[PDB]
C-alpha cells in the first residue's frame, strides 16, 4: 500500500497481492496483477499514454473526482467495484460495467447513474450530500436494491435517493464489538418493503415514503442496535406492518394506517397515533406510548402486556393530567353488561376538569379508559380507550406521571 500518489510519469506494477495505489493523469501503463487491488485516480482522464489494469482479482478503482464514466474510456480495464471517495469526490458517476458500488467521505452529492441490476451499495464513511442511486432499467414492477452501511463506528450514512425501487433492503453492519447505531434518511417514494438486517442499530429517517406498507428489521441482532423508523403511510385503510429487532426500538405508525407492530426482543416504545392499530411489545419492559385519542371503534390493541410493560398516556390527558396512584379496582358491571355499557360506566364521572382513568375487563379481554368529557356517556374522538387482550389484573398496578407500570 502507497498513500502518496505516484508521478505521472512512474511505472507501477503490482504482485499477486492486494495492492493500493493513488494515480493522477499518469502517462504509463500501470498493471496491478492478480489479487483484490484498490487504485485510486484524481483525474478521470490519465495522460497520453496512460493506462491502469486492475488484473485478475475483485478489483477497486476509487473515483476522487467531479464525475467520471470509465467504461467509456478503453484506458481503463479490469475493475470490478467502483467506489466514490476522496476530497474531490463528487458529481455523477456511471456505473456501467460495475458490480458493486461504494461510497466514502464526499466533497459533495454523488450520483450513480446506469447502475445495474443485483449491484448494491455499500456506504464505508460519512458522505457530503445526497447520494442519489438511478438504476439502468426501474421500469420493473418489483425492483430491489440491497444497500449496505458498514463501519466500525456509528455511522452517519447522510440521505440516500433510491427512486423506482419497490423494496429496500439495508444491512447495518459493525465490524467490531462494540454497539453503535447507524443514521440514515432514505428516500425511496415507490418502495413497499422496507427490509433491515445486520448487527448494528438504524435511526431511519423515512419522511416522504409514503408507499410503505411493510418495515422489517426483525432480523437485527445485537441487544444495542436500537432501530427507529416512523411510517409515512397516508392510504386510507392501509394495512402496515413494522417489526423490530432485538434492539432497543421505537416504532411509530401513522394515523390513518392499521398498523401491526411488532417490537420483538429489548425494550421497545410502541406509539399509537390513530386508527386501528395492533401493538405486540414481545420480550422485555415495552412501552406503549398513546399519542391520539383514537374512536370507540378505531383504538389500539395490545396483545402481550405483561408485568414491567408501561403505558404511557401523557398524550391523551385532554383536561390536565392522571392523577398518580395505583389503580383502583376494575368497573364490574352486572352478567350481561355489554361493552358500551362498560364504555359508559368507564366514563360516567366528570372529565372536563381533570381527565381520570378507569379500567375493566370484557369478554376475556381488559380495557382501560381516560374520561375528559363532563357527560356520563362515553364520548368518541375525545374519550380514550384501550384494548389488552387477555384478563390482566391491572389493581396493583400504579400511574406515575401519567405512566402505568405492570405489576
Ligand atoms: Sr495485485
Ligand atoms: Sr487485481
Ligand atoms: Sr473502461
Ligand atoms: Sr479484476
Ligand atoms: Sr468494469
Ligand atoms: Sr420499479
Ligand atoms: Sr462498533
Ligand atoms: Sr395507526
Ligand atoms: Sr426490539
Ligand atoms: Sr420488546
Ligand atoms: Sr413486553
Ligand atoms: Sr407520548
Ligand atoms: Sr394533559
Ligand atoms: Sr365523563
Given at each position: 500500500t502507497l498513500g502518496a500518489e505516484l508521478a505521472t510519469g512512474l511505472v507501477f506494477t503490482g504482485g499477486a497481492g492486494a495492492d493500493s495505489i493513488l494515480l493522477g493523469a499518469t502517462t504509463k501503463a500501470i498493471v496491478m496483477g492478480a489479487g483484490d487491488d484498490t487504485v485510486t485516480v484524481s483525474s478521470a482522464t490519465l495522460g497520453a499514454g496512460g493506462s491502469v489494469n486492475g488484473g485478475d482479482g475483485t478489483d477497486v478503482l476509487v473515483a476522487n473526482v467531479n464525475g467520471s464514466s470509465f467504461s467509456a474510456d478503453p484506458a481503463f480495464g479490469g475493475f470490478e467495484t467502483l467506489r466514490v471517495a476522496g476530497a474531490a469526490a463528487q458529481g455523477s458517476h456511471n456505473a456501467?460495467?460495475?458490480t458493486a458500488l461504494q461510497l466514502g467521505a464526499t466533497a459533495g452529492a454523488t450520483t450513480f447513474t446506469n447502475?445495474?441490476?443485483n449491484v448494491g451499495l455499500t456506504v464505508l464513511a460519512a458522505p457530503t450530500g445526497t447520494t442519489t442511486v438511478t438504476l439502468?432499467?426501474?421500469?420493473?414492477?418489483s425492483d430491489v436494491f440491497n444497500l449496505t452501511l458498514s463501519s466500525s463506528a456509528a455511522l452517519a450514512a447522510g440521505t440516500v435517493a433510491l427512486a423506482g425501487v419497490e423494496t429496500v433492503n439495508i444491512a447495518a453492519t459493525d465490524t467490531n464489538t462494540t454497539a453503535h447505531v447507524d443514521t440514515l434518511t432514505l428516500q425511496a417514494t415507490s418502495a413497499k418493503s422496507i427490509v433491515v438486517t445486520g448487527n448494528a442499530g438504524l435511526n431511519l429517517?423515512?419522511?416522504?415514503?409514503?408507499?410503505?406498507?411493510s418495515f422489517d428489521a426483525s432480523a437485527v441482532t445485537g441487544t444495542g442496535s436500537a432501530v427507529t423508523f416512523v411510517s409515512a403511510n397516508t392510504t386510507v385503510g392501509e394495512v402496515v406492518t413494522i417489526r423490530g429487532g432485538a434492539g432497543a426500538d421505537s416504532l411509530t405508525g401513522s394515523a390513518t394506517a392499521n398498523d401491526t407492530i411488532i417490537g420483538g426482543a429489548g425494550a421497545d416504545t410502541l406509539v399509537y397515533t390513530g386508527g386501528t392499530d395492533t401493538f405486540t411489545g414481545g420480550t422485555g419492559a415495552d412501552i406503549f406510548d398513546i399519542n391520539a385519542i383514537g374512536t370507540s371503534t378505531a383504538f389500539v390493541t395490545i396483545t402481550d402486556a405483561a408485568v414491567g410493560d408501561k403505558l404511557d398516556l401523557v398524550g391523551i390527558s385532554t383536561n390536565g393530567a392522571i392523577a398518580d396512584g395505583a389503580f383502583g379496582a376494575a368497573v364490574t358491571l352486572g352478567a350481561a353488561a355489554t361493552l358500551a355499557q362498560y364504555l359508559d360506566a368507564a366514563a360516567?364521572?366528570?372529565?372536563?376538569?381533570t381527565s381520570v382513568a378507569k379500567w375493566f375487563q370484557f369478554g376475556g379481554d381488559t380495557y382501560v379508559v381516560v374520561d375528559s368529557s363532563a357527560g356520563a356517556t362515553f364520548v368518541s374522538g375525545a374519550d380514550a380507550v384501550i384494548k389488552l387482550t387477555?384478563?390482566?389484573?391491572?389493581?396493583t398496578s400504579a400511574f406515575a406521571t401519567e405512566v402505568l407500570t405492570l405489576a
Open positions: 456501467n460495467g460495475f447502475v445495474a441490476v439502468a432499467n426501474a421500469t420493473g414492477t429517517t423515512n419522511t416522504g415514503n409514503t408507499a410503505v406498507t360516567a364521572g366528570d372529565g372536563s376538569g387477555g384478563l390482566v389484573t391491572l389493581t
